Structure formats: C-alpha cells, structure tokens
Design a protein around this ligand. Sequence first.
Ligand code: NI
Length: 341
Amino acid sequence: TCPFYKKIPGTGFTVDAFQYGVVEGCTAYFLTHFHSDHYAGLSKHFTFPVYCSEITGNLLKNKLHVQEQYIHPLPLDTECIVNGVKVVLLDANHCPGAVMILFYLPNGTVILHTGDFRADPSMERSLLADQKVHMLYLDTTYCSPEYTFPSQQEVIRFAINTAFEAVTLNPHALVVCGTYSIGKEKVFLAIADVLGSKVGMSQEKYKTLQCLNIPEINSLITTDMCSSLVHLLPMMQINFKGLQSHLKKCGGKYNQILAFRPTGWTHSNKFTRIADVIPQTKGNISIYGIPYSEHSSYLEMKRFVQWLKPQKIIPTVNVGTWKSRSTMEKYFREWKLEAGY
Ligand code: NI
C-alpha cells in the first residue's frame, strides 16, 4: 500500500508511486525522474495518465514501452493545469529529465516536492522566488553534517586532468567508466572530449542516451567499441577481475586500464581532498573512486531550506528508522531557530 509521504493532500495526485497497484483515489500519477526506485511498476500495460518531463517521457516510451496515449509530458518553468490544479515542473539538478513539482492547491496551500535533487543557489531565482511554500517534501538522502563532497566542477577537473595525463604518458592505455543508471554523463563525456574520442558502449546504453536531448550527442557516443578509447561498462564490472577480462577482449590494442567509479559520498570524504585522491592498483589496472554526487550535500540542503522557509517539512529519504527520523527532525528545528522562521 502507498505510503503517506507519496500522496499530495487535497488532490487526486501521487508522486513516484507505481509499485502499489491501483492507488485508491488517484487520478494522475507524477514521475519525478527515470531511476528504478521511483519508476518501479511502470510498463506497456499501465493505462492511467503519467505526468513527467519530456526527457522522462522519451525514456518511458522507448525503454519501458509505455503507450504514447498515457504519457503527458509538460514543459519546464511553465504554469500548467492538471485535473483542475495548477502545477509547475522545475529542474531538480539531479539526472537528465529530473524535476521538482510545485502544486497550487485549491484551498491556497502551496506544496513543493523536490523529487531527488542537488540544491543550488540558482534555484533561489526560479519561479520559487515569487511565493510562499507551506509544505516541502524533501530529498533528505545526505541530511547529516558528516556528508561533505566537492562541487561537480572540481570532480570533473580531476577526472579530465587524470585521464589526459595517463593517456599522454601511455597512448596504449584504455579508459573505462562505470554506469548503472542515467545520471553522471558529464564524467565519461568530459574525459572523451579531452582525449578526442567518442565514448563506446552497449546498444542498450546507446539507446538510453539517445532519449536524453543532449546537444550534439551523435558527435560524442558510439556502439563501435574498436573506434573508441573511452569505454562504458556496467558498474558491477568495475573491479580487477572484470577489467582484466575486458582488456583480453580488446585484442592487444591496449596494455593498461585506467577506470573510474563515480560513487556518491564514501567515508574517505571525511579525510581526503579531491586533489589528494589516489587509486587502487593491481598490475596494469588502476581504479579511481570519485565523489560525483547528484544529491545535495548537508550544507547545500540547509541553505536551500533556510532560504525557502517552509512551514512544514516531510522527508522522503531515510524514513525507515526511528534514529534517522529523530536526527532529521533535530536538524530541521536547528535550521529554523538559527534563521528565525
Ligand atoms: Ni534518483
């Protein structure tokens, strides 16, 4: 059964709630982004209206085969009426096509649902500037002060400089990048751009990328592995055994692998600056774990909430334990006492 923090009061609406069968009283299902924990349940057999971004609707039609007649894409930054209720979709700074949803309830209450997001000061100048928000349904993934990580720009600077140095030292090195979902495409696109290569990948991953409206994509990706020196593999294969096996397949073109695992936060973030990051190495294989996050750090989250000044916060992540819930509630009260709302 659908949990309460996926229901929008005063409406017929749910958010990210496709795994519960037919939800009682739901007239429109919203989908914030195409990540499996959120889309779980959708298929060619779904026959209710789904509301989402254009990019999410391209993925629903081509990857999950949802029929066209039930996909309702909305433009961003544009007031739209859905089943008698005004809504707006805003960029969530998460993966491609990911949105936050503003709902203007018939009684005057305004609700913001962040979906999954990486808070940024740019959001302070969106359509959020113009009005009060009563209720915030918040992505609390990293809601504790131990969760620190660098900017995405610093992480990409490290990746590009690391890959360009290695391949200039050894023109017979191959670069490999791990993936298991959409998001984090800048990692492998930026490395291929500095090296003058396309990114090589499976037909299934190429198909997925072609749904994303990324400009000049035909220029940056390929299914011809032999033409590429930056290869994408499943995240599960980014280990010494899986990389050894891959290097065999390349027919003696290469004699070294430099591999990247974009993770979120890891405990090594408590101690190590991005500059000082080192790989794990076995023979001619090196693996770098790089802290490329598509979720808010603690400080980014706190800044956003202290700017928005919501009357009530509903967490949507870390809700299953009492200890997590009590910790989050304590930080929400701190933020409110410090800022004065
Ligand atoms: Ni996500």
